[PDB]
Design a protein around this ligand. Structure first.
Ligand SMILES: [Zn+2]
Length: 409
């Protein structure tokens, strides 16, 4: 069942994607995207929202950045119901951003906050989670975070009830705050808490580490610490702000402990633990395989242009990219000065797609082997399923393949 976390067979169905690029997706200021699935190979870049009328910048079921990062620009609000995956990280800029991930957030890279940024996650996997820049950040964990490195150097990370941290090393310094509710557990290799403002406020939490380093009059309020390796203490003279309601159980009680906390320590030379790391979800395994996405979407199978799959409320284009102007030509079928008469637009192309700056409302799908670049802002994008005659065409040419994918067991 942990193997099936965030499994979504529509990931492999390219008729469920509103935006796809085999290179980059470059947004512009004040774009609001409502989509089902979105894929990019290289980076997806947002710009700052300084005049965005929407509740959200992007609302999606799934966002996948197979060979790139996801870059925030400022005041962007992103909601991903199922999974957000990036290879190379998630980089917050500009402050005031929000990322809401309701099942799985996974990066092979660094997730880095800027200040006044919020992440609300259920399961989170990453190489490094940086809560260091600015102040008034908030990373809330509903199930777990699993990481090689967690740096908390400002406010804050909250562990909701019964959630877990799986490290990796954890380093809290400067104004770093880790707060944790009932039933929480923290596992780490190295756990370092440095200075008089570094805080763990987790009175019901058990912390397991190999090495524990405390430098200064840290603020620790926890239930139990287990240390199987070495406890290194320095600049610790009173320990007034170290509260441990059960015990610090450790392989070797360290020398020169202040007398007022000496009581806390209990020596157990055999103390040991084996961290019960979550398995990598099957969906992530499959996304990372070289079969994805080209088993199911093959833009190189576009060997002819198809320009007559149009209807009363839509225009389509399947383009080899030989004619530069065909893409401007389809976009000009939508007058931005006439809202109620908006028609749907479906573009599938071996070229990139540069969306003209006068577009302000697009319903449909944009699928490009080159980059997808919005040359303007102040635009609302909403996914609409491709018309059936277009899907049938794409399938006939094996530009897409739809397979009866099932969750593995
Ligand atoms: Zn619309």
């Amino acid at each position: 069942l942990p193997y099936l976390l965030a499994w979504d067979s529509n990931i492999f169905d390219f008729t469920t994607y509103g935006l796809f690029s085999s290179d980059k997706i470059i947004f512009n200021n004040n774009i609001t995207v409502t989509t089902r699935n979105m894929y990019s190979s290289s980076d997806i870049t947002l710009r700052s929202d300084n005049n965005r009328p929407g509740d959200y910048t992007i609302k999606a079921d799934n966002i996948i950045v197979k060979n790139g990062s996801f870059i925030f620009g400022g005041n962007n609000k992103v909601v991903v119901n199922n999974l957000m995956y990036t290879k190379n990280g998630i980089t917050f800029n500009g402050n005031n951003n929000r990322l809401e991930s309701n099942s799985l957030l996974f990066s092979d890279g660094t997730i880095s906050l800027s200040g006044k940024d919020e992440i609300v996650a259920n399961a989170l996997f990453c190489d490094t989670l940086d809560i260091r820049n600015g102040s008034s950040n908030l990373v809330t964990i509903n199930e777990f975070a699993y990481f090689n490195k967690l740096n908390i150097w400002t406010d804050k990370m909250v562990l909701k009830s019964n959630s877990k941290l799986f490290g990796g090393d954890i380093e809290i310094r400067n104004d770093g705050i880790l707060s944790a509710d009932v039933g929480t557990v923290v596992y780490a290799n190295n756990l370092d808490i440095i200075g008089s403002s570094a805080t763990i406020d987790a009175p019901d939490t058990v912390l397991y580490c190999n090495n524990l380093k405390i430098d200064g009059e840290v603020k620790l309020n926890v239930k139990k610490i287990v240390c199987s390796g070495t406890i290194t203490i320095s600049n610790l003279n009173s320990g007034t702000n170290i509260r441990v309601s059960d015990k610090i159980e450790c392989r070797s009680i360290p020398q020169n402990i202040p007398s007022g906390i000496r009581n806390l320590f209990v020596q157990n030379p055999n103390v040991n633990f084996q961290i019960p790391y979550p398995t990598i979800p099957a969906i992530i395994e499959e996304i990372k395989k070289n079969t994805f996405p080209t088993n199911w979407i093959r833009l190189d199978n576009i060997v002819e242009d198809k320009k007559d799959i149009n209807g009363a409320n839509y225009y389509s284009l399947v383009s080899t990219g030989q004619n530069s102007n065909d893409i401007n030509e389809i976009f000009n079928k939508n007058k931005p000065n006439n809202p109620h008469s908006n028609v749907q637009i479906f573009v599938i192309t071996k070229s990139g797609i540069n969306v003209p700056p006068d577009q302000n409302h697009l319903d449909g799908v944009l699928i490009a082997n080159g980059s997808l670049q919005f040359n303007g802002g102040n635009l609302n994008i909403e996914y609409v399923r491709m018309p059936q005659p277009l899907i049938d065409y794409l399938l006939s040419k094996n530009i897409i393949k739809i397979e009866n994918v099932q969750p593995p067991v």
